[PDB]
Scaffold this active site. Structure first.
Site, short mmCIF file in Angstrom:
data_model
loop_
_atom_site.label_atom_id
_atom_site.label_comp_id
_atom_site.label_asym_id
_atom_site.label_seq_id
_atom_site.Cartn_x
_atom_site.Cartn_y
_atom_site.Cartn_z
N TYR A 1 -19.69 26.52 5.35
CA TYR A 1 -18.80 27.59 5.81
C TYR A 1 -18.57 27.51 7.31
CZ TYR A 1 -22.64 30.68 7.55
OH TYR A 1 -23.70 31.22 8.20
N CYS A 2 -17.54 28.20 7.80
CA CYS A 2 -17.26 28.28 9.22
C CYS A 2 -16.63 29.64 9.54
CB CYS A 2 -16.46 27.04 9.68
SG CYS A 2 -14.70 27.10 9.21
N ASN A 3 -15.80 29.75 10.58
CA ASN A 3 -15.12 31.02 10.87
C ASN A 3 -14.14 31.36 9.74
OD1 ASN A 3 -12.87 32.82 11.89
ND2 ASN A 3 -14.15 32.88 13.69
N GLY B 1 -14.98 30.92 4.84
CA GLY B 1 -15.33 31.33 6.18
C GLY B 1 -15.94 32.72 6.17
N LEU B 2 -16.63 33.03 7.25
CA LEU B 2 -17.55 34.14 7.35
C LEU B 2 -16.97 35.50 6.98
CD1 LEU B 2 -20.34 34.95 7.86
CD2 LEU B 2 -20.14 34.36 10.19
#
Length: 85
Positions: free
Chosen positions: A47-49, A74-75
């Site tokens: 995962y990322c932003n 993403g978050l």
């Protein structure tokens, strides 16, 4: 057989991350996953932003022959418990 790896820049990990994830930025992950998760069959959730860098990470890790990669987006869209800066 699951881990969560934030492939985002580490600056944002210090503001918010999923409770119990690791951060390893994408460019390190492509090496450092071999040290953190030598078992290629572990479910590496990336995962990322927002999803775009984790989308790339899923493909990269599939190419590295990880047999159980999952993209978690993403978050913001992940609705798991969080820890913050």
């Amino acid at each position: 057989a699951e881990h969560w790896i934030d492939v985002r820049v580490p600056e944002q990990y210090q503001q918010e991350h999923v409770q119990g994830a690791i951060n390893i930025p994408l460019k390190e992950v492509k090496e450092r996953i071999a040290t953190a998760v030598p078992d290629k069959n572990d479910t590496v959730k990336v995962y990322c932003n927002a999803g775009r860098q984790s989308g790339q990470a899923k493909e990269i890790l599939s190419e590295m022959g990880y047999t159980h990669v999952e993209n978690a987006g993403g978050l913001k869209d992940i609705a798991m418990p969080k820890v913050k800066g």
